[PDB]
């Protein structure tokens, strides 16, 4: 009965300390991880029998709880729902704990190969018992190098049991032969002994049958290395295939075309691009690797039946979310009815030589080009996408993109000395020099003197690993590999894709130089002159406009040009007026713009309503209307531009990953206006969430931008994870702020003008009810994450740097609003001091771990002052939070 767990005093004041206990822990794990550097971090803790016990612990109390609380009498239901989820996914952890099979796959031409190869260590031992048996067992001691632990498992039945010890990893490896030599002693009955282990290398223990004792009753056989597992079906590979970009013999993309058979099923085949996966039993695989033999490759390969009732909890946590946010008797909406009730050829100077004219601009656009991903374009689009990758900023010093693209094309030695390429990480700066705090580079920079690429060998070495989770250098070299290559197209002419190649459409649409050269050389062609002609017109003209700026005949050439591909191409060729129009919206857009104003007007009235409830009147109605005009205005302008997407483009509205969130935008914005004329802050809030879904949408289409071949950051999963993400930070921002306003508040009141009380505990409400937002969609979000890294990338979740501390916030946050039920008075200072303080979880997440993955004073002069304010503050902390009252009082 639950008197004795009363005395076990399963109770919130318990559930606190557990929920604290795991949240040091967790993070604790992060320092200890940076300084081993190694797995024993997850020997210490992640994997340790602590959390084997303390999520039961937990979750039995939770139980407890609920029915200490009576939550069941009580309707309550969303409530329930929400706790009946975190039991779901902790179970579901659990299982996946121990059902949860990893490895490896090597795929090898004609090889049909049936094993897993678990990254995984284990030592074997065995025994052949006198009656020649074969007594086994396999222990995982996982040491490396960095820990050597002591083994304590002493287990066989065929006589005494045995008994084992590990002293030291006395290693001597040549690389000539893997010696990962290692000193251990064993124990039988009479019969101790010491032994010398020599794991093999990590492909496949072999060599390791040193058959260290013989006596029967004694017979022993020792390894320490990897194990394999047999699939209940063959693979093998098609044809591996590896295609490189043209100026820097790199690595492009990988492809598999594996087949799949088994011994009465007929073969499936079945096909693999470096992003895509493959799936037939409960095993799924991931193609990571390649041998560098170019004959065979690697998959990454995991199983995890824990996988679907971890996702019914997601599901389930989700409903509860939403369905709490309006049930009423929920703490939100009744915090919200608290607060109704209380209211030659030289560069300078060519940047103007080229913006100042606009009239080619106007023509060259209408051109249609190739993007030889398959798909034609008009020139601005691929133009402005291929400087956007190249620059990440949506406007270069000047030239509106297809002006640089010109200028680039035709002028393009002075463009080669501009640092026009985007580059993150300074590690990667510190090989081409000049690493000052600079965010581009020059084309001319990752020459030797010499015609030597130097970041070849760097990103030849790291594609081979990138595909997996890996440090920002190992991605940062492959993309500015990418954007070089793209600069190296963009030069030489090998973009301007304009001439097909046969008037059927049959189409490749040929550069401009091997066009001539072959096609038009090699077929009879007749317009090879003409062709000729226009192009030698074309670079003429050009290279005079820089000295004349009456440079028109390029005007009369692109006129030449367009009529040309118009009288050449067949069914292909997009109306003008159509071509007119897209250009015509990829001008008039309004999504950029828009980004601002969401953000801008959300803050303006939530600062306006600040300033009034902290003086405890009301604001006039007047700016109500005025700023729910604002927001009806560009709530208008953004449907109808949005509109006008759809009719323009076809991309039917279930669209790509950038529209999706514009409509995600409208729909919040559209919640705003048309349910809540009524409260300025839903106006906040709303305009808020949509500002920030619009941002991240855009941004996600400006460094995502596709160019050739390689997949991009566009997953679904990915940009509703960021946005969220970023929303639960800033509303955890607006709640620190709240929360130091009440702090220095407590400061002002004087027993005189008592009205400041009856703000103290408004301001209190508010701060809850932002902090439940914050918590919510964090909560969210941070799961969002596991789903995504589930489907894209590998296997799940995973202790890892930043995700532990999104965790420990969570964690921190839950301490904070429960607490509640355990702080008996005095509510509104306790909550404003930890709310303050809690603040330090988004704050690690957010920059510190980047430093952590020192005495920073700054920390130390922001802490103390909170410390402080706290300090004195508390002098006059004596507050209550009742629920009925008027004027003098709440
Ligand atoms: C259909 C099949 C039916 C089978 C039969 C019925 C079911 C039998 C079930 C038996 C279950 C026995 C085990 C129960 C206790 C296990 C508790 C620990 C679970 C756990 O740690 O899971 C981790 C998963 O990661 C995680 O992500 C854990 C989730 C996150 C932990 C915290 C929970 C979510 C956040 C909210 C917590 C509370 C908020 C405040 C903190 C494992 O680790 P791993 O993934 O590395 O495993 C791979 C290792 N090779
Ligand atoms: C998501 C996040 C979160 C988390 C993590 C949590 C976690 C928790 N929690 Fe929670 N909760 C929550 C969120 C939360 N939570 C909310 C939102 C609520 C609601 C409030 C009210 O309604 O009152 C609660 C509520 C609640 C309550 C009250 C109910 C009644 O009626 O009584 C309790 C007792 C609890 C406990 C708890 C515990 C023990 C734990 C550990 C696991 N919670």
Redesign the pocket.
Known sequence: MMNIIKTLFCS?KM?LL??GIYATACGIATFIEKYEGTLAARLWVYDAFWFEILHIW?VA??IG??IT?K?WQ?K?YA?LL??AS?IVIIIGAGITRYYGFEGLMNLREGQSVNFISTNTHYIFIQIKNPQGDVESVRIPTYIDEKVNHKINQHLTFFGKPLTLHTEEFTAKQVNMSELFILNASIDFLGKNEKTLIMRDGNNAPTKENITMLEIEGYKIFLAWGIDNIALPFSIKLKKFELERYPGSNSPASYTSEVEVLDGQNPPLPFRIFMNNVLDYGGYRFFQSSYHPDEKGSILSVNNDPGKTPTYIGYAM?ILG?IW?LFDKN??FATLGRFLKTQKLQDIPSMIKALADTSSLTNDFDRILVQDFGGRIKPMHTLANEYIHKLTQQRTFKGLNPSQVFLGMLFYPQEWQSIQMIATKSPKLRQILGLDENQKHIAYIDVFTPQGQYILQNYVEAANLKSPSLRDTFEKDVISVDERINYAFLIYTGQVLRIFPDNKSPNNQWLYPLQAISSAVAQDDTKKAKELMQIYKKFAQGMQQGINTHNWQEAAQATRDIRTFQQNNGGSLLISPAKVDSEIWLNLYNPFYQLTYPYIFISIVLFIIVLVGILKNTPTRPLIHKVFYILLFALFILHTCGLGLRWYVSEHAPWSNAYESMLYIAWAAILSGVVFFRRSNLALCASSFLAGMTLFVANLGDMDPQIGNLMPVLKSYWLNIHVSVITASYGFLGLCFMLGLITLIMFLLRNEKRSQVDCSILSLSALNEMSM?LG??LL?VGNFLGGIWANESWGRYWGWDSKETWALIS??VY?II??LR?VVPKNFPFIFASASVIGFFSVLMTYFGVNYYLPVPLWVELMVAGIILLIIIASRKRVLDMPHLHHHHHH
């Open positions: 919130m559930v557990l929920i937990l109390c939770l709880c609920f609380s939550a009580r309550k409530s929400l706790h975190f946590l979310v709490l929920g703490r439940i918590l919510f909560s969570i964690g839950a609003l429960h039920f």
